[PDB]
């Protein structure tokens, strides 16, 4: 009956931002008390509702997205900003309601010497609307040219890896970020509160 958020947070594997994973979690009881009582969560953003009230104000439907990005822009993932990740990899809607959680996991993902196993879209044809996991891998172009699918003058791979190394600094350390998006409909609910 319990909502497997702790699954997502304590999940062994996380995806890259461009391939940000989505969970249509529902029909379970939520324990956000477990969430905001975490000592782990260095950052805890919430927009549209106090993390206090979620425990006892309950929703039609919820989405739990997750991905991995370098630490400092954790607040790029916010309601209505422009920027690298906001524009081309993940954009919350201006009228977004939900929360943003993250934490450092150098012990998990940082590897001595070299790691490059997380990706983010480097540049795209047009801005990304809210909520589209656009797994698009064809070589982006920026002009009048036959891309020919081959790198060169202008047409470039749209995705770029990371450099998560333990010997690097806190702003650049890999933070695993979970986005709790919320949605209400002209429909019955699926998640609610205790005692």
């Amino acid at each position, epitope marked *: 009956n319990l909502c497997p958020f702790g699954e997502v947070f304590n999940a062994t594997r996380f995806a890259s931002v461009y391939a940000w994973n989505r969970k249509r979690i529902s029909n379970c009881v939520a324990d956000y008390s477990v969430l*905001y009582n975490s000592a782990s*969560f260095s950052t*805890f*953003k*919430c*927009y*549209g*509702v*106090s*993390p*206090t009230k979620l425990n006892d104000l309950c929703f039609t439907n919820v989405y739990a997205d997750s991905f991995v990005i370098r630490g*400092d*822009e954790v*607040r*790029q993932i*916010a*309601p*209505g*900003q*422009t*920027g*690298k990740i*906001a*524009d081309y990899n993940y954009k919350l809607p*201006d*009228d977004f309601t939900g929360c943003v959680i993250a934490w450092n996991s150098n012990n998990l993902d940082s590897k001595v010497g070299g790691n490059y196993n997380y990706l983010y879209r480097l540049f795209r044809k047009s801005n990304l609307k809210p909520f589209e996991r656009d797994i698009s891998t064809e070589i982006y172009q920026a002009g009048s040219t036959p891309c020919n699918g081959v790198e060169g003058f202008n047409c470039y791979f749209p995705l770029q890896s990371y450099g998560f190394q333990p010997t690097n*600094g*806190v*702003g650049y350390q890999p933070y695993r970020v979970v986005v709790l998006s919320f949605e209400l409909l002209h429909a019955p609910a699926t998640v609610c509160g205790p005692k």
Partner: antibody
Framework: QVQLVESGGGVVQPGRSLRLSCAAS????????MQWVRQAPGKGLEWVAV????????YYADSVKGRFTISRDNSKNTLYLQMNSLRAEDTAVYYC??????????????????????WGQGTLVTVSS | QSVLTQPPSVSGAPGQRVTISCTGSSSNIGVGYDVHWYQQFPGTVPKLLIY???NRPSGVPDRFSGSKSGTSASLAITGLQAEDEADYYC???????????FGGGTKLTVLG
């Protein structure tokens, strides 16, 4: 795209009350915390006041504490300023600004926005006798 | 608690890497609160430049890259050109009975 424009500025004698404002467009204005910031010419621009997304939470700088009134109508989709006990040094340009919405924090306490994304065009206040 | 200390102005050859620092108090920056830097041209609207300690919003093409330390912050203009000539403000929250603090103001200066 979002557009913010100020209005109501002018030359005012020190001491009397005044009403500034700023109209909003291009974004869900009702659910963003807004800010008013000061810039004396040639001097560093400084924060004046910040209004919660719902207008419930308000914060003024110390130098402007009490003398100033912030207000805003979600339905009207705009932001207002009420001026009491003006002073000459406050002759400056005033900017209405939008940043990321004020996130509620863990354990429930509100937090004001930490930075400003877009700005109004600006209004002038000349607190001069 | 204090105003974020800034240099008055700095200079650099066009297109080379230069830096601006910004220092704060324990209750100012080292408490954990982050910085952001704005620019504005003389007598113009202020525009945000780098809000994440090292992230760029759109229209901030490149050459702008922030940082973080224990108690100091820095932007590198890795390549400057007269379009960058403005004054730049380092803004960070304060936990000293205050809200957001704004830098004194630093002028970039290209060689004549």
């Amino acid at each position: 795209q979002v557009q913010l424009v100020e209005s109501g500025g002018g030359v005012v004698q020190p001491g009397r009350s005044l009403r500034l404002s700023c109209a909003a467009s291009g974004f869900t204005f009702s659910r963003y915390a807004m800010q008013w910031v000061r810039q004396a010419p040639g001097k560093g621009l400084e924060w004046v006041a910040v209004i919660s997304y719902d207008g419930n939470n308000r914060y003024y700088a110390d130098s402007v504490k009490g003398r100033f009134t912030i207000s805003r109508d979600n339905s009207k989709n705009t932001l207002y300023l009420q001026m009491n006990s003006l002073r000459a040094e406050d002759t400056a340009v005033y900017y209405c600004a939008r940043g990321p919405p004020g996130y509620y924090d863990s354990s429930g306490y509100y937090q004001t926005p930490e930075y400003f994304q877009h700005w109004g065009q600006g209004t002038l206040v000349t607190v001069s006798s | 608690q204090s105003v974020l200390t800034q240099p008055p102005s700095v200079s650099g050859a066009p297109g080379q890497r230069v830096t601006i620092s910004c220092t704060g108090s324990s209750s100012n920056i080292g408490v954990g609160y982050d910085v952001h830097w704005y620019q504005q041209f003389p007598g113009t609207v202020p525009k945000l430049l780098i809000y994440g300690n090292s992230n760029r919003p759109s229209g901030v093409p490149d050459r702008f890259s922030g940082s973080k330390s224990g108690t100091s912050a820095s932007l590198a203009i890795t390549g400057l050109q007269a379009e960058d000539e403005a004054d730049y403000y380092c803004q960070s929250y304060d936990s000293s009975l205050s809200g957001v603090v704004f830098g004194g103001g630093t002028k970039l200066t290209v060689l004549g």
